Amino acid sequence: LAGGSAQSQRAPDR
């Protein structure tokens, strides 16, 4: 469940 694009960066995506 790690490894997705949504998890890739420190700040949340908008």
Partner: antibody, heavy 117, light 113 residues
Framework: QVQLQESGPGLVKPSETLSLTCTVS?????????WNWIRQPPGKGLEWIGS???????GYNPSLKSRVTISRDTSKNQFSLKLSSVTAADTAVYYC??????????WGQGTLVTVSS | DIVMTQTPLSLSVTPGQPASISCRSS???????????LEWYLQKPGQSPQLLIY???NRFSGVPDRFSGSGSGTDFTLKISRVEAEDVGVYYC?????????FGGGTKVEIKR
């Protein structure tokens, strides 16, 4: 310039452990992003092996999970891949890549690993 | 896992003419945060893949250019509006919405001449 550079190509005997590193320059691995491994077996398409995040969190392809380990060595700004128990099916070009919300913007040059005795 | 099925498998296109590639996914690649992490790459002969489009329709160049991405849910399209010699290679769609991230099988684009 962000640049990713995989270690060199060569042989690994079957049943042994394939080992690769990616060295990152122009950017610190712990600043942000996720640091991916992806392979392309001869004449086939691209398979995601797994990644490690800027914060050390690893994710794996469920199909490969039991044979894969990924780590970071922040002292050399590198991240690594080990793939154990290999066979000819693991012969491939292995790529490292940086992932963000906005894509795999940067790739290493690709390193061919041949699994043979 | 999400299967990404590209059609067609290959294309021949006369320079200056358009091409269109389709990518269908076996399940939605809308993520819970609302974003759709659908990306397109080109892999030129002997090279690493290079990103063209991210988040469905955002151009890597950041500026209006010959690559256009569209679609939603399970159905996506890359258009190349005026193919040039330099565009030749294999195109892949990719989804990073659900683990594991998966690529399409690729569509090989050749110049008809």
């Amino acid at each position: 310039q962000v640049q990713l550079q995989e270690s060199g190509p060569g042989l690994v005997k079957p049943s042994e452990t394939l080992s690769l590193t990616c060295t990152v320059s122009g950017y610190s691995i712990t600043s942000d992003y996720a640091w991916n491994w992806i392979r392309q077996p001869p004449g086939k398409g691209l398979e995601w092996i797994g990644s490690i995040s800027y914060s050390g969190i690893t994710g794996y392809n469920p199909s490969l999970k039991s044979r894969v380990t990924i780590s970071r060595d922040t002292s050399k700004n590198q991240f690594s891949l080990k793939l154990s128990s290999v066979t000819a099916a693991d012969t491939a070009v292995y790529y490292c890549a940086r992932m963000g919300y906005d894509g795999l913007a940067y790739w290493g040059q690709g390193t061919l690993v041949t699994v043979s005795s | 896992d999400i299967v990404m099925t590209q059609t067609p498998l290959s294309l021949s296109v006369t320079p200056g003419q358009p091409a269109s590639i389709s990518c269908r996914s076996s399940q939605s690649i809308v993520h819970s945060n609302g974003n759709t992490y659908l990306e397109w790459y080109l892999q030129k002969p002997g090279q690493s893949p290079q990103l063209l489009i991210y988040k469905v329709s955002n151009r890597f160049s950041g500026v209006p250019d010959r690559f256009s991405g569209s679609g939603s849910g399970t159905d996506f399209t890359l258009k190349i509006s005026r193919v040039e010699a330099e565009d030749v290679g294999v195109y892949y769609c990719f989804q990073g919405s659900h683990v594991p991230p998966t690529f399409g099988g690729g569509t090989k684009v050749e110049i008809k001449r």
